[PDB]
Write a protein that binds this ligand. Structure first.
Ligand SMILES: O=C(CCCCCCC(=O)C(F)(F)F)Nc1ccccc1
Ligand SMILES: [K+]
Ligand SMILES: [K+]
Ligand SMILES: [Zn+2]
Length: 367
């Protein structure tokens, strides 16, 4: 039994008329119909899940709105009120950073997104479901304790981990983030806390700026329980898999969490505009396979995938379907881009990719 969350409203997120920042007449930034982060990309993933027949092998899980209490396990009271404030606006607006807009009443979607991750987590921890994928939107991993950041209103995976901790009585949770951008928000929230291990693989210095160095390791009792794996631009399947086997899986095995949550972004894909990595659907399949198999060994298979980024409306759906096919064990479709992307490279571990991954190995000893 594999849980699956999609709520119609995830496809209704209002990203405005700009590309990234707002449309801007002085700067001569022409309005456009599809902002980089337009919800269509993730809706296409859902429709592919359905049209492929994969949905026949899933157990649909209705999202429940994250309460104020759920949100406060990961965020400050000032953050929550500010988001209520912004959501009350006639056309809503920018949440603070200039690129993260909430539409009017947008808070309802932000609660359903966080809440989808919570509900899926609850039913897996219960033993109703062995595992699941929550295809939520807006994403979560850039939102720190006290802010919205980089399209993220609330930190979905941290709301879920906070629920696993406080309500389900779990002692140890791991959050593995393979969205191509640094999970700065998740790092921030659990910084001082050894009871949540946070692992981020990312393109070095992609987003946020000046963030996600390997020297960011947590603090206090949480020192040694934040792991960053910054990778050079151009890294593909070989680099990601090397990183899985040499860093991620050993970290997880050393840590012994009771639940693995995956911040699952597909913006490391070969065709993504918002990074320069070369991962293909098979790369993501192989990453999902190894993490699921790891979960089966160390925490009775309790693994929850939660949607993060990815900006290719053409390719993301097939990267996403590959991960769901690994959960259900049922293959629906080939990757119709495979032969096209195959010759492009990324499948060889380059010396500089190896050196980047080898820098993190010593950190394993402190877990
Ligand atoms: O770099 C950006 C774009 C942010 C990229 C957003 C990545 C978000 C995700 O993939 C996720 F949605 F959070 F998962 N903006 C920016 C950064 C610094 C100065 C001015 C603008
Ligand atoms: K990441
Ligand atoms: K931590
Ligand atoms: Zn991203």
């Amino acid at each position: 039994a594999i849980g699956y969350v999609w709520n119609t409203l995830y496809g209704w997120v209002d990203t405005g008329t700009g590309s990234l920042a707002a449309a801007n007449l002085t700067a001569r930034m022409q309005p456009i119909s599809h902002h980089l982060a337009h919800p269509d990309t993730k809706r296409r993933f859902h429709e592919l899940v359905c049209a492929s027949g994969q949905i026949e092998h899933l157990t649909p899980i209705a999202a429940v709105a994250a309460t104020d209490a759920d949100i406060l396990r990961a965020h400050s009271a000032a953050h929550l009120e500010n988001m209520k404030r912004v959501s009350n606006l006639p056309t809503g607006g920018d949440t603070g950073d200039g690129i993260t807009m909430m539409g009017n009443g947008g808070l309802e979607i932000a609660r359903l997104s966080a809440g989808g991750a919570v509900e899926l987590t609850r039913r897996v921890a219960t033993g109703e479901l062995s595992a699941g994928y929550a295809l939520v939107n807006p994403p979560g991993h850039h939102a720190p304790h006290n802010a919205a950041m980089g399209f993220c209103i609330f930190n979905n995976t941290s709301v879920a981990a906070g629920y696993a901790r406080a309500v389900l009585g779990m002692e140890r949770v791991a959050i593995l983030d393979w969205d191509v951008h640094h999970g700065n928000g998740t790092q921030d929230i659990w910084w001082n806390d050894p009871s949540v291990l946070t692992i981020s693989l990312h393109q070095h210095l992609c987003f946020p700026p000046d963030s996600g160095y390997s020297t960011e390791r947590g603090a206090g009792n949480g020192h040694g329980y934040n792991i960053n794996v910054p990778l050079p631009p151009g890294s593909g399947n070989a680099a990601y898999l090397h990183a899985m086997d040499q860093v991620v899986l050993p970290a997880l095995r050393a840590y012994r969490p009771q639940l693995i949550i995956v911040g699952s972004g597909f913006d490391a894909s070969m065709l993504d505009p918002l990074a320069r990595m070369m991962v293909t659907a098979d790369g993501f399949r192989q990453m999902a396979r190894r993490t699921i198999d790891c979960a089966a060994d160390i925490c009775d298979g309790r693994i929850v995938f939660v949607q993060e980024g990815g900006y290719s409306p053409h390719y993301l759906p097939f990267c996403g379907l590959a991960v769901i096919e690994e959960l259900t064990g049922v293959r629906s479709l080939p990757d119709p881009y495979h032969e096209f992307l195959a010759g492009m490279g990324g499948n060889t571990l380059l010396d500089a990719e190896r050196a980047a991954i080898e820098e993190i190995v010593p950190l394993l000893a402190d877990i």
